[PDB]
Symmetry: C3
Subunit: 607 residues, 3 copies
């Protein structure tokens, strides 16, 4: 009669474990260990980049503006028939004697042009010396001086003098620049000077390049300049270089090549650069700038660079400087500065430090820092993102490896310990612990130290009926603790006798009995729900919902890291920068060289 | 006789816990809490960058091409002895009266050159006015017009006229550009005009810079232009500026400085910029562009910028625009736009939003958004990678901190709860729970609420023999549940009597007995394996391998994040860009100024 | 009398669970599954970028330097009154007949200038042919040749010859460059040639642009050049282009447009580019370069590009090359190369591979790789950081999602399994398991398969006294196992009788008794500590500290990922690059065009 109302469940006939099949629990696994901690060397670091700025220096030009006009007069009007313009060099001798000495220039110009020695007379008059005045003030320009402010033109009546010669002697202070390898240079005027800024006579200067004839170049020793405005002469003297070109004479103070140019530029000072050896490479990290560089395990000889004699000295100045402001107390140096070549073409100067705390290895370390110890130009990349990605990935990589490492270690330690809990629980309830461990409904029992298991058998719910009395009629005072049941293995078969174990297990022997008692209330797992009993008499049925639920579970909500799309982004596009410069040479040239195609006629022949 | 076959194990004699040493389990620890959730302000944002484009405007040049040729004739041939070329300005008056009015130019040119007032006659003939025609079509150029298409040269017979003057009046529409601070400017021709585009007479224009004499500049009020092709005059008038230079007269419509130039440029519009205050700085995040900026907690006054009056207005236009298309319904604004200065030199306009949902704080928030509330130019960096690294690290940082936080919280909660399981397991098996907790083989027993522990003693395996009967001969019906054993503490010593506890513990008192029974099968942990018994009679030995193994362990395979190396990578190297421009000025100059060293002789004097 | 010394605790009177309230444990939850594993296609890849380099080619210029000087002599001096300089084209005919054939030039120059046909005579003497010599050696320049090295000037006595004409015929080998769309081009001299490099007569060359008159251009078929130094003529012939401009004639070998220019440039070869379809886009990853690109699911037709016929062929050459060196053995290709357009404007050529191992799908896959299968110019971004961020985030994203996924899965599996432990522990100690699960001090007991719970009641410590005898006087031989106690529910109330359960639970019925015994030592949780008993006689009190503590906890120390700030960092700032070029055009122009404002007088009129 009484069948389960919660049809939606399963019953299991669990054979007495014959003893034929025996299993053992797996015993505590070897658990991993926290990885060996990587050692970091503390240090001061200076990072260098390829130098891309020109060598820059001061020069002074000496030339005269020569103009020869050809004039012609009509009735109440005059026209230029021509205007000759040229630039002429001031001779060495006039620069020293006249100008530098007295601040004066000759009113005539005499130089070589088109293979001729030529002479021009201001106003076509007799030669004098003229005083030099500042050029009219102009915004953002270096200093200039000139003698003449007007262009001389012949008057209408001078019928034997239809040409008019002007001379304006000009001195200018100009910036000069020279690209590596400093074989020639330019002035601020746009004029190329095809001689090394480092060319000269003394100390292997005569090595450097010159495209000129020897007499175009003078090197004046013990030279004292004389400001042309203050009229004051310098306190110390220089080695004054002068080169006369066809259009100007240019002076400059001679200084040595190697102490003046360097192929590398200091880019970053880093207080704490962390050095950690691994992978056959060193790695250098700076959290200050969030950058990580990677060099070979061997030092890079500073002697291997061309014109790299700013590096050695640039490193130390800043280091000593930093070490003072940060380490002189808590720390000391270790060994003499080292140099390594990072990918990206960076050059790192590194000063190993040491806290007095670990002073015990001073003697130890002082050796190691000398094992990596020991011509070309280094191309540095424009983008540092790689070393910054490297830094970021690394920092994030190590962190999760560590905390997930630690997690994993605990998990194992926790499996090992809970076994002990299962070892006691097996004995209390072998069928359930077996069923769960083994991973299928089984019947089990201890055979000493191992467990026997037999595989259960399913029975339906329409194939399962319940008896409404747990009271043993013949033996009053004695009662079934749980309920009795009848069932059929298949939907239509002999109905069997047994009692309801836990978890809908159908137990064959009705052998589980207690001494009866009063108040008897019970709830017995029955199908998808519970069956209820008062005083060993079947009362009614229920569903799990009909009972409040509490949990034996510890909570944990993990959510995944969302997908994210990184779109291209640039502060200024390649064209914005192409459009930032005021004048564009290509554009101007193109336009200019359209003048005659646009406005005139380049093909027609008249005659 | 019977010694263990699995020699590879250890036995422990466990003293009865004297009671001398008592321990307690540690009780539930205080478990951490999920960090206080950081609040995000929703907003619309506009980000600005340093402006690096020139101020660009339209101008018109007026000048005439003047050519004076000098010719000479041989028998059946003629040669140029010279060609004078010059550019002359069109006077103010001719520009207005002749050109703008009628589209005509005078055929003569009269201007000042080299301190002379000079006059040129097309064909050296009498003055007329000539019509202006478009310049011959050219690809990609602005508009031009000219009067003359041929160069006038004197014919062979004209023996009293060996010079030939040409005049070609030219008007061009050209682009003009001016860099900050807009004190001078350039034309598309390459010509510098050394006067502010904003120079003029009205409203403090006369403030701006001019390098010219006053009469070179005219400001024509109520000016109506007349297209020189359509012949149509403009519908409205302008304030027309004209400056006569020595080589051309240049006009342009006068417009005010402050409403025409801005030192900042809008770069990004962001619908949702998230504002979260922390660390004494704000942070602004955009997932749309994956960028995170960092500003001080105080607003940056828009009045603090020079010529920054595009910013205020540029912000609002887009915002109102965005707020409409996205927030007018679900949201409202909060307070008046604010401005902050990010590192990298970015300027963020931010419009705080609010969902009608949280409208309850409208009154609250409306105050907070006014606490940070209130000359120089801002340099913006070219690289945004920092703010994008920042964004990425932050998003990844917060996520693991959170899920590992949650993990940690559960772990603790799980240790606290399982204790309760150990508290029941201690009572069932004190030696084992003690041994594991304590972390060494001990003997234990409850002394009420605390546990007593004594440290066990090791015994070898050759020092351990087993008895092959668990049947008590004298007391049939009574039997040992486990096996009896004999052993010696040291390899050669008095053989002791006791029985085999669990886990190879050697128990001294042979006191563990049961009522005998039938079918008796048992397996007892013996050395590295098990000892087997049927009916209280020793049968044989086994190894763990000889028994199938199931596991009481939950699985978890963590693998570490692999090491990864980020190599330098650039879309175009610094040289590729240096090689992208069609013409290179430095290169051309260098080459050109080699012409005479290469092809001619600059030193030889003839005479 | 005896009250607890550790006042700092709580006692609970736990009502016998009336049975009124029943709960059930929650049963095993459904646990999540490891996400479906994403499939990666192995491949070879070639990535292309917008081409930004000019089309570069070789040309040869032919022109003559013509100089006409005007001289004048004073007593012991001479002055240049003028110097006419011009460049004249070499006619087509002289280039072929004289130069190319014999390495000679005519000593006269005849070309059109200013609408006149003009003729110049070296030394004003009769015409000859002159031999061509190399230009004087110059560092880093292409080849040149000239006929004349001196400038001819008339001597002092030649009173009927005051002008002096020089001619220097010049040939140069120059680089020429042309920007897209290759309509005009430039020479190394700075000269614009306003004709397509691809202009010509044959095969639709006459399509291309020319700004010149037809007779300025010749196309010489079957042309054999003759080195002007080695005097050796080429082994094969070319289609020689010649264009005469007003200032020079320029030759070059004609080659077809489409096979000579390409709008795209190969940037990267990638051995393993991993292709994984998701989100309606493909993704392409390279660990070699740590870059991830994102394209639409459909192929991008190579026929869609303008002048993109370098791409098809450039792809295969490298691929076949790579496939050989890496895949020909372990792998094979799959389908014909495909092309996709990534964001950032990158173009990826991809060759799908396949290990012989999975050869079983060769037939399957061979179809799929053909489903995405099929004019403008592509702008590529300068910054690749996005695709590298993308790559890094993705790799880090997937990893934590995976290991935290796996973690979560275990956690659940572990909650499910431990329930079974709680199911056995409930029966051993219902009050404690109830109290913990339920989450408040309760009293509990099994009612079959569910648990009854009643909520306990707090009692103070001053409200709790202890009896110093556990020995039952009237029933010697029988003794309380734990202690007896008296207490009051409120500070001043009837003192109640009961005994001390565990965990400071006050049990009402003094029903827990044992048979007395000897040695009796006990410790009973009492307040914040323990109460101690020897032989059922109260001895003294203690604190937890007074007892050593061991732990039932597995350890786990998680630390959070630190906050990190990424500061802007650039290898070279925008100005450093602006300052890297030797000569600056804008600067030079500005300065130059200050010459007269600085040094002369542009306003004063004399007469
Ligand atoms: C390291 O050494 C190898 C060969 O020894 C060389 O090819 C490589 O360029 C070096 N790299 C660096 C970072 O110095
Ligand atoms: C923030 O304030 C400090 C001093 O108050 C200043 O030095 C710093 O430049 C400011 N930074 C920003 C991002 O405005
Ligand atoms: C993908 O397709 C959409 C429309 O179909 C188009 O707007 C978008 O530009 C395409 N993106 C790529 C990466 O090709
Ligand atoms: O006047 C001496 C000075 O010019 C030194 O440089 C020489 O070595
Ligand atoms: O060819 C140069 C010409 O275009 C300029 O002088 C116009 O101003
Ligand atoms: O014609 C009037 C117009 O030029 C205004 O700009 C004057 O303010
Ligand atoms: O000095 C200028 C010269 O090199 C060019 O005119 C050659 O074309
Ligand atoms: O001499 C033949 C050669 O110039 C070929 O290019 C013609 O197609
Ligand atoms: O205007 C050109 C002038 O500044 C230079 O020639 C000076 O060298």
């Amino acid at each position: 009669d009484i069948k389960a109302e919660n049809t939606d469940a399963n019953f299991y006939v669990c054979p007495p474990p014959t003893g034929a099949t025996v299993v053992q629990f797996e015993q505590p696994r070897r658990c991993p260990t926290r990885p060996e901690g990587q050692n970091y060397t503390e240090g001061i670091a200076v990072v260098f980049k390829e130098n891309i700025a020109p060598y820059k220096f001061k020069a002074t030009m000496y030339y005269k503006d020569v103009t020869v006009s050809q004039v012609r007069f009509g009735h109440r009007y005059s026209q230029f028939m021509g205007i000759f313009e040229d630039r002429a060099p001031v001779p060495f001798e006039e620069v020293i004697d006249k100008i530098n000495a007295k601040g004066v220039c000759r009113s005539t110009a005499k130089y070589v042009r088109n293979n001729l020695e030529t002479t021009a007379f201001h106003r076509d008059d007799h030669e004098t010396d003229m005083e030099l005045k500042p050029a009219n003030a102009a915004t953002r320009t270096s200093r200039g001086w000139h003698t003449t402010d007007l262009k001389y033109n012949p008057s209408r009546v001078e019928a034997f003098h239809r040409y008019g010669t002007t001379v304006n002697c000009i001195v200018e202070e100009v910036d000069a620049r020279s690209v590596y390898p400093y074989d020639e240079f330019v002035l601020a005027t746009g004029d190329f000077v095809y001689m090394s800024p480092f060319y000269g006579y003394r100390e292997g200067s005569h090595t450097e390049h010159t495209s000129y004839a020897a007499d175009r170049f003078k090197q004046v020793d013990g030279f004292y300049a004389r400001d042309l405005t203050t009229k004051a002469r310098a306190t110390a003297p220089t080695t004054r270089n002068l080169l006369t070109t066809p259009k100007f004479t240019v002076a400059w103070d001679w200084v040595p090549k190697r102490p003046s140019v360097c192929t590398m530029t200091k880019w970053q000072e880093v207080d704490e650069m962390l050095r950690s050896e691994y992978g056959g490479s060193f790695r250098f990290s700076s959290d200050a700038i969030s950058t990580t560089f990677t060099t070979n395990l061997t030092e890079y000889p500073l002697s291997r660079v061309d014109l790299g004699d700013c590096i050695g000295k640039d490193a130390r100045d800043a280091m000593d400087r930093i070490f003072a402001r940060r380490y002189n107390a808590t720390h000391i140096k270790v060994g003499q500065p080292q140099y390594y070549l990072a990918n990206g073409g960076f050059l790192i100067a590194y000063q190993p430090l040491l806290s007095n705390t670990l002073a015990e290895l001073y003697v130890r370390e002082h050796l190691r820092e000398q094992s990596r110890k020991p011509v070309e130009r280094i191309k540095t990349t424009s983008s540092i993102e790689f070393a910054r990605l490297q830094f970021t990935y690394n920092h994030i990589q190590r962190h999760v490896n560590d905390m997930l490492g630690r997690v994993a270690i605990a998990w194992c330690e926790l499996q090992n310990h809970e076994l002990t809990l299962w070892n006691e629980a097996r004995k209390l309830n072998p069928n359930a612990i077996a069923s769960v461990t083994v991973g299928r409904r089984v019947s089990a029992r201890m055979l000493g130290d191992v467990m026997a298991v037999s595989t259960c058998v399913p029975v339906a719910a329409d194939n399962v009926i319940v008896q409404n009395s747990m009271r043993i009629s013949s033996r009053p005072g004695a009662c079934y603790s749980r309920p009795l049941v009848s069932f059929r293995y298949e939907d239509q078969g002999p109905l069997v006798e047994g009692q309801l174990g836990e978890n809908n297990e159908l137990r064959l022997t009705r052998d589980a009995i207690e001494p009866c008692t009063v108040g008897h209330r019970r709830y017995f797992t029955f199908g998808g729900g519970y069956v209820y009993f008062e005083e060993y008499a079947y009362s009614h049925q229920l569903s799990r919902a009909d009972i409040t639920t509490v949990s034996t579970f510890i909570d944990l909500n993990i959510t995944m890291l969302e997908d994210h799309e990184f779109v291209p982004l640039e502060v200024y596009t390649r064209h914005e920068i192409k459009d930032s410069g005021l004048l564009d040479y290509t554009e101007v040239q193109r336009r200019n060289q359209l003048h005659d195609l646009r406005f005139a006629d380049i093909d027609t022949v008249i005659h």
